Amino acid sequence: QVQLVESGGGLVQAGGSLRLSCAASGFPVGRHFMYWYRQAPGKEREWVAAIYSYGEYTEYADSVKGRFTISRDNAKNTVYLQMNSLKPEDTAVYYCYVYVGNEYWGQGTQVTVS
Amino acid sequence: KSRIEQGIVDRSETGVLDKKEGEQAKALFEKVKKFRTHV
């Protein structure tokens, strides 16, 4: 009965900052790897970032390295995706993925950058 | 000393001896063992 739903997306200029929220209900956020994925229109889905289940070990894609950030809060059970130095290339729909017994995908927030 | 504690041992010479005389010496060792045990 795990629900993954995103919020905080929208349309923003390039070179700014944007923040995403992934709401987790049925599982503790800090105990499972949280993966951010993007799918550009007319393109296969591309991984964005991940957080380890321990040690706050974070992973980022090569094309987005040093620009995006990932964080989570167990008290409120959410995953934060902070997007910085945005470009028209990073225009894609973002999903927060988990695996608690099975595969779970979020609703997806539309992100467009001028 | 460094040489003694590092498994390095001194040279020892060797030779070649007849097979027949070697078998004779082996049998003589066995016989001396048996005789010492008996005596």
Place this chain on the structure above:
Amino acid sequence: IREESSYSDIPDVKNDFAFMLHLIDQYDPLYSKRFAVFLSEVSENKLRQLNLNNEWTLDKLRQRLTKNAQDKLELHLFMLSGIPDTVFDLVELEVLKLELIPDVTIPPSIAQLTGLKELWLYHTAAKIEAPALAFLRENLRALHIKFTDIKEIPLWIYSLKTLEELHLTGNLSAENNRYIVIDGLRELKRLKVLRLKSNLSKLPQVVTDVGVHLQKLSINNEGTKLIVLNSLKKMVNLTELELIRCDLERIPHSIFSLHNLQEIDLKDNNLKTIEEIISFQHLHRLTCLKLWYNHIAYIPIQIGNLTNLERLYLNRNKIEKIPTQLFYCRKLRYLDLSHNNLTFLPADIGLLQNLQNLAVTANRIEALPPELFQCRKLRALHLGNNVLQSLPSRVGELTNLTQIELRGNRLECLPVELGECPLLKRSGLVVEEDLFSTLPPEVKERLWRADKE
């Protein structure tokens, strides 16, 4: 006699044999000394050495020579009183294996073994002389040391400055003096392959120090838990890392800092979740990745990001399903999934155009997808111990198929299209004889003729 000439292996004589010796001594001590040698044990062992030299003639040793898996000429000596002096007359000898050979001195005659590269000291403490030591220092490439005791490790092995491959077999750690016998590993300036099977509870510091030039580190704790604890992110020249039976139960984060690694093995680590493989995208040349013999319950979809993989091993696990993202690695060439709870193969399995070996032995595969036969270069298959109801007729599409295992399935008849494989022979068709009887007689004759030729 023995206090002067140093032959202490003559025990004192008891009754009725010391009396006659005393009489002889009164007559002539010369007979006493001519008898003492024959009663000594050092003399008996030396005569045994001479008899060994005479018995193991060069022809006998050459007939005893075999070739190990690495196509090297091998001589394995087991339970001999010493090294025969004639084992150094075979110039073609490549590997010298010594097991359970006592009171052994490496003679200077070992310098005749120009082609000697590997020395296996199995439970054998051997002393060496300066000429032989210098020869081995200039020539010996690999050393296998198996020891039940620290003192059984020869202490001259740290002076072999051309050694490249050192295999330490046996428990080495001790209380209050641990990791001190291997303090001499720093002097091995050309070491590349270091294998540690010693039940280490913590990686020794000297291993980290010498690992800056190591190219392969292999550890086998045979059940002992190994704690890396930030001692592994300095061996940047490493290219193969094997952690067998380390009881990790978790992938340490130190592995992903080895930017030159290519082959990582994590066998018998009791792994449960392998979602750490997301960090493997840092390793930009990771080709072979063995995760076999674990408790892995699922393959994370993040395994698709490892587009440079070529060999993937996940057998002997608790995998129940195959994700579709696993088939994003189009460079994959080996996908061994034997002994799992798989029940079907996703249709994307045909996307891996370069797959060559695919073993799904001991699963619940009742039927194979027709897309599976798009992998035209699939040289070998292993579909044994499954529940395959019927073999698809498209098996003949795989022209390069050479060895296909089929024993243990619920098959009734073999397809006639199985015989159209140009290279498949009766040797390569591993199947029950009852099933094999179902082939057409032309197919049987062709398979037998191919097996003959």
Place this chain on the structure above:
Amino acid sequence: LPQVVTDVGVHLQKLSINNEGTKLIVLNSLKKMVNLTELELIRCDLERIPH
């Protein structure tokens, strides 16, 4: 590099030093062999090309 070798190198053509991994220090003891035509520093553990 010994001083005696530096002295004798005034007439040398080829020099080969093989230390078997042990570090060797040149320290301005090599420029006197201006006749040298083939210099080999094998396993000298230089860690950097000397000037």
Place this chain on the structure above:
Amino acid sequence: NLNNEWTLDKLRQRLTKNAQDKLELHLFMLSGIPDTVFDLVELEVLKLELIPDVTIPPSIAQLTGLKELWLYHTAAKIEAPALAFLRENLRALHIKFTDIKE
């Protein structure tokens, strides 16, 4: 006994060629230098490995074409004639020693 053990025929058959297109004879672990090795004037390189207490005989003058002498773990005591011959007929000398005194 050595000449009985290592005759001229056995030595000449034992003669081999190295990679340098040089005719060389390898003497390894012998009691001494057989006196019959010097009747082969074709030699150019001589290898004395692990031969104890060798004295360089004056017969080395017979080896006109000898250019290289290899002394591996074999310290050589020399005489005036042999030393004078080597001072004008030796071009390459290979010395491998386990100790300074060697």
